[PDB]
Amino acid sequence: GTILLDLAPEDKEYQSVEEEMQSTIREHRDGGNAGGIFNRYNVIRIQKVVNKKLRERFCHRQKEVSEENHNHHNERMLFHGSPFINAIIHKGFDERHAYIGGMFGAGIYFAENSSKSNQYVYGIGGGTGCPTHKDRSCYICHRQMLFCRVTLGKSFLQFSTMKMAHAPPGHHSVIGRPSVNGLAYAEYVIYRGEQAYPEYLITYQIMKPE
Ligand SMILES: Cc1ccc2n1CC(c1ccc(C(C)(C)O)cc1)=NC2=O
Ligand SMILES: [Zn+2]
C-alpha cells in the first residue's frame, strides 16, 4: 500500500515544499473564521507519499490528457486540505467523494494558496475546528494538508459560480480565476480522482501572530 518517506529539514526538497506553503499564505475575506488567524506556519514534518498503484493510475491519465491536449498535460503543484486526508493518502483522490457544494459543482478542489486549503482541513468552512478543543484557530493541535501534483490539461476559465457534475466538454478541469468583484484567490477543480496525486503530506501548526 502507501508508504510515507520522511524528508529531512536540511534537504532541498523539504525546503522547497515549506517555502511554497509559507509564501502563499494570504489574508482571507472571512476574518479568519474558517482557518484561524495567522501569518506563518510551524512545520512539524514533510513526508513523501509512495504508492505504486496510485502513481500508475495518475501517470496513465496524465499521458491520456497530454495526448488530448497538444502534448501539454499542464500539471500544477497545488494544495488540498480535507478532514479525510488519511483516506486520500491510502486510497488516492476520488471524485466519488467530491465537494458537492463547491462553486463549480461536484469536483475535487485545490488551491495555489496554502492558507485557502487550511480553511478546509477541519471541514467545509473549517467545520467545528480541531477535534480536541473545537477551535478553528487552534494553535496547539497538529494539522495536516497535502501538496499535490494535479493534471489540469485544457482548463475552462470562470470568474463566478458555474455548477457542474463533470468537466466541460472538450476540457479536463475548471479554474476559478480571481477578479475585482469575484474570487480573491484561485481555485482549481478536477472531476476525476486520477487527475491528482497526493505527493507530499505536511504536518503543521498555524502560529499565533505577535
Ligand atoms: C474550494 C476549495 C479550495 C481549496 C480547497 N477547497 C475545498 C476543499 C474541500 C476538501 C474536502 C471536502 C469534503 C467534501 C468535506 O471532503 C470539501 C472541500 N479543499 C481544499 O483544499
Ligand atoms: Zn486543538
TrEMBL record:
Entry's localization field: Chromosome, Telomere; Cytoplasm; Golgi apparatus membrane; Nucleus
Domain named PARP catalytic: residues: 8-210
Family according to the record: Belongs to the ARTD/PARP family.
Full protein name: Poly [ADP-ribose] polymerase
Annotated organism of origin: Homo sapiens (Human)
